[PDB]
Design a protein around this ligand. Structure first.
Ligand SMILES: C[C@H]1CC[C@H](NC(=O)Cn2ccnc2)CC1
Ligand SMILES: NC(=[NH2+])c1ccc(C(F)(F)F)cc1
Length: 330
């Protein structure tokens, strides 16, 4: 089997991407944030505290003839940005782009933090990291990909995110029309539960490539590119007027600037992020100071190849017996 679904930016800045997902019988379609940096499929629901729902579409398990309460199971997750959610668990039929999993754990939110309530465009998360990170207790649950894998034509999924445009998540096949050149594959460590790999270096604009190992995660659920302070300083030094602002929380730059590209290495291959992809717009409405899309990872404890990086590539999440990652230009 295979599946193919379009993923759409939630706003004009590509702050996140949503993908429609069918849950239950009859289908209830929710727009979920596919997150290769976590492993829970959770949704706003008829159980979510009413004051914490503000425009999201909800899953109502009592209206699904295939929903079953997973007795005694609860979940609770906190993310890197300080947001969180928690609740109970159902199993139900879940379909993405024509690919169906029966018995998928659907984590129903009883509580969500304010940043989830405040984002009416995201109805929940669909985790695509390794199932070892799943938070369900006392019986850990599998991701949608982990449940589908054996049925897929090939044990892979691909992320093809757009810049200010829709893109595609495919399951079970590689669309050879969706990229240029070849796909370069690189080793993955699953020890921290992530799609963790080592980039071979970087360049800023037309500058020379610096060979240096950068260990980080391929994370569709993080907006920005978080890299070591040395690398980030080298990038922003090429932008007149750019500075790190403790009050704003990162590097800012004049909105009048034309940003240089940023290249990252995948083996001997190179992925080029155009400068425009690095512009996250005014820091507050009407400001002429703009927020940068490349930020320091110092104090995160890991580098994060988030959407800014991934959207410049066609990315293969290869879930073969030994997982790997593939990157192609597009
Ligand atoms: N913060 C992030 O990196 C992800 N995100 C989710 C919603 N908007 C952005
Ligand atoms: N769910 C995610 N995509 C995610 C959240 C937090 C972190 C961090 F802790 F490293 F910051 C990494 C990945």
């Amino acid at each position: 089997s295979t599946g193919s679904a379009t993923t759409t930016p939630i706003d004009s800045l590509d702050d996140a991407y949503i993908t429609p997902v069918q849950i239950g019988t009859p289908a209830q379609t929710l727009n979920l944030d596919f997150d290769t940096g976590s492993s829970d499929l959770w949704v706003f629901s008829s159980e979510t505290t009413a004051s914490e729902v503000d425009g999201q579409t909800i899953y109502t398990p009592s209206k699904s003839t295939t929903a079953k309460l997973l007795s005694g199971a609860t979940w609770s997750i906190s993310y890197g940005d300080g947001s969180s959610s928690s609740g109970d668990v159902y199993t139900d039929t879940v379909s993405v782009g024509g690919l169906t999993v029966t018995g998928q754990a659907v984590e129903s939110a009883k509580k969500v933090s304010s940043s989830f309530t405040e984002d009416s465009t995201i109805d929940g998360l669909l985790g695509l990291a390794f199932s070892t990170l799943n938070t369900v207790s006392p019986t850990q649950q599998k991701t949608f990909f982990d449940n589908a894998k054996a049925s897929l034509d090939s044990p892979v999924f691909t992320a093809d995110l757009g810049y200010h445009a829709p893109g595609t998540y495919n399951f079970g096949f590689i669309d050879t029309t969706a990229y240029t050149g070849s796909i370069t594959y690189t080793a993955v460590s699953t020890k921290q539960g992530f799609w963790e790999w080592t980039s071979t270096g970087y360049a800023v604009g037309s500058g020379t490539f610096k060979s240096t190992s950068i260990d980080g995660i391929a994370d569709t659920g993080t907006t920005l590119l978080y890299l070591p302070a040395t690398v980030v300083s080298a990038y922003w030094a090429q932008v007149s007027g750019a500075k790190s602002s403790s009050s704003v929380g990162g590097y800012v730059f004049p909105c009048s600037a034309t940003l240089p590209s940023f290249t990252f290495g995948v083996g001997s291959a190179r992925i080029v992020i155009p400068g425009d992809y690095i512009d996250f717009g005014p820091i507050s409405t009407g400001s002429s100071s703009c927020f940068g899309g490349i930020q320091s990872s110092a104090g995160i404890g890991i580098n994060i190849f988030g959407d800014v990086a991934l959207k410049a590539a066609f990315v293969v999440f290869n879930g073969a017996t030994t997982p790997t990652l593939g990157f192609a230009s597009k």
